[PDB]
Amino acid sequence: NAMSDMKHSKLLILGSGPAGYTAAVYAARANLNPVLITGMQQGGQLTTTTEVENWPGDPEGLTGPGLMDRMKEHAERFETEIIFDHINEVDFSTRPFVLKGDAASYSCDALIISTGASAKYLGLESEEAFKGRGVSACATCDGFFYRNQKVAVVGGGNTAVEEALYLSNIAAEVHLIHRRDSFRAEKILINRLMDKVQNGNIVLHTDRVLDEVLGDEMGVTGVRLKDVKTGGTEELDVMGAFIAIGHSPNTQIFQGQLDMKDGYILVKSGLEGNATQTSVEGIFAAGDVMDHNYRQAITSAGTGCMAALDAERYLDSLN
């Protein structure tokens, strides 16, 4: 443990997802000697999915972990300095910028924020009570515990549908709960889903919200659903409940210091360059932390590249 013998670098990148690692590749080739803080989820959100089929140019068989191992190797090839830490506090009122991690503090002249997003929970007291004892937000992490069991999935987007598909090969049955009667997942995934609904072991509970997670002193034994149209409730017996209701941008540490809207970092955007510039000159943002609309790996990688070229131009304008 050190006393603010701060590590200074010209360019600091927060995050080890596709935006952060693409930013590193471009910044290293620009001779910026980037330093990248991985955060607690090394490799980012893709490391919890098993198949990526829309990373353009890859043959059948890519996995999430596989792509992000390649991305780390690529940043390392250009001598990116990669540090396993997690930033818990920042000071952007001062130059150089100061970021406090759990291991050390860091300072920089330019900062790329690509801290991505974390799984959202419903915010129920019973959901919180059963976390780790049958409530989970990560099906690849916890699915194998439910072999031949009944499990629930809550949500109606790409993550929920993918998690229900993944669990259907492990669990005896998957109860997919969603508050409307149609899904916003990719159509190819909806086709796979509906094939398992009519021929397989997925059961739909549309127009439902999770009212309460039910359980004993050991863990989950069911969920109560509420009909969104009538207010009536029913019970479903399951041993596990996977929460797949979206991801929230990881921006809590920047509150009050960057312009933000609904937790997303605002950037210049536009067609005239400097499109990833935040409200603080010299701080740029890339990936899911500033995109509430597209939220793909390829679009995250693309804005990661833009943040590195923006930062390079900004640092060049200093000297």
Ligand X SMILES: Cc1cc2nc3c(=O)[nH]c(=O)nc-3n(C[C@H](O)[C@H](O)[C@H](O)COP(=O)(O)OP(=O)(O)OC[C@H]3O[C@@H](n4cnc5c(N)ncnc54)[C@H](O)[C@@H]3O)c2cc1C
Ligand Y SMILES: NC(=O)c1ccc[n+]([C@@H]2O[C@H](COP(=O)([O-])OP(=O)(O)OC[C@H]3O[C@@H](n4cnc5c(N)ncnc54)[C@H](OP(=O)(O)O)[C@@H]3O)[C@@H](O)[C@H]2O)c1
Ligand Z SMILES: C[As](C)(=O)[O-]
- Catalytic (active site) residue 305: no
Any contact of residue 96 with ligand Y (CB under 6 A)? no
The answer to whether residues 236 and 222 touch, using CB atoms and an 8 Å cutoff, is yes
Q: Of 273, 303, 249, which is closest to residue 19 (Cα–Cα)? A: 303
Instruction: Calculate the CA 111 to chain-centre distance.
Output: 20
Number of residues that bind a copy of itself (CB under 8 A): 54
Which residues within the stretch 230-259 sit at the binding site for ligand X (CB under 6 A)? 247, 250, 253
Which residues within the stretch 183-202 sit at the binding site for ligand X (CB under 6 A)? none
Which residue(s) pair with 237 in the sheet? 222
Among 48, 105, 136, 278, binds ligand X (CB under 6 A): 48
CA distance 32 to 11: 7
Q: How many CB atoms sit inside 10 A of residue 310's CB?
A: 25
Which stretch of DSSP H or E encloses residue 2? none
CA distance 274 to 196: 46
Least distance to ligand X, CB of residue 78, Å: 13
The answer to whether residues 228 and 144 touch, using CB atoms and an 8 Å cutoff, is no
Q: How far apart, in Å, do the first and last CA atoms of the chain sit?
A: 34
Which residue(s) pair with 24 in the sheet? none
Least distance to a copy of itself, CB of residue 36, Å: 13
- Catalytic (active site) residue 138: yes
Which residue(s) pair with 264 in the sheet? 261
266 binds, options K ion, ligand Y, ligand Z, none, Cβ within 5 to 8 A by partner type? ligand Z
Among 245, 258, 265, 289, binds ligand Y (CB under 6 A): 245
16 binds, options ligand X, a copy of itself, ligand Y, none, Cβ within 5 to 8 A by partner type? ligand X
Any contact of residue 49 with K ion (CB under 5 A)? yes
303 binds, options K ion, a copy of itself, ligand Y, none, Cβ within 5 to 8 A by partner type? a copy of itself
Least distance to ligand Y, CB of residue 138, Å: 11
The DSSP call for residue 46 is G
Least distance to ligand X, CB of residue 255, Å: 12
Contacts to a copy of itself by CB under 8 A: 18, 21-22, 25-26, 29-31, 53-60, 67-68, 70-71, 73-74, 77-78, 186-188, 191, 261, 264, 266-267, 269-273, 275, 290-294, 296, 298-306, 309
